[PDB]
Design a protein around this ligand. Structure first.
Ligand SMILES: O=C(O)C1=C(C(=O)Nc2ccccc2-c2nc(C3CC3)no2)CCC1
Length: 134
């Protein structure tokens, strides 16, 4: 047992707050914001050795990242940004930093009760997205 076992599984979006404004701050255009905001993703998290895989599946896009904690990777985001990402575990929270064009955004994933809470921060704007087990 490890590290992320409390994250592993299949998770479904149950609430979102301030996601349109988060997306505006990251630079997402109108049409992508409207369709992305309407998405109801499932989040599938798995671990195999040192490799963590996170899949986000929705009607708008299916995206998947695999990574090793602390080891930077190049990522293409849902909104088609090319970013440099690093994911670490800090005090039981998965912290995902994306860097591009001299900007930065941080996505934190934490277990809280029976939920997986995703907090997304860009400049002063926070979005909170709550998932429960599927
Ligand atoms: O995993 C989550 O809750 C989180 C996100 C998400 O769900 N995104 C999406 C899920 C389906 C479809 C589209 C998106 C989409 N995100 C974005 C830009 C904001 C990045 N453009 O489209 C993004 C942050 C964490």
């Amino acid at each position: 047992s490890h590290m992320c076992d409390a994250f592993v599984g299949t998770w479904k979006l149950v609430s979102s707050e301030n996601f349109d404004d988060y997306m505006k701050e990251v630079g997402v255009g109108f049409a992508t914001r409207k369709v992305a905001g309407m998405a109801k993703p499932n989040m599938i998290i798995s671990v195999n050795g040192d490799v963590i895989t996170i899949k986000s599946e929705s009607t708008f896009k299916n995206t998947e990242i695999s990574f090793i904690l602390g080891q930077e990777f190049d990522e293409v985001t849902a909104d088609d940004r090319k970013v440099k990402s690093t994911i670490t575990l800090d005090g039981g929270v998965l912290v995902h930093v994306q860097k591009w064009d001299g900007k930065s955004t941080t996505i934190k994933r934490k277990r809280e009760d029976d939920k997986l809470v995703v907090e997304c921060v860009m400049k002063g704007v926070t979005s909170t997205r709550v998932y429960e087990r599927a």
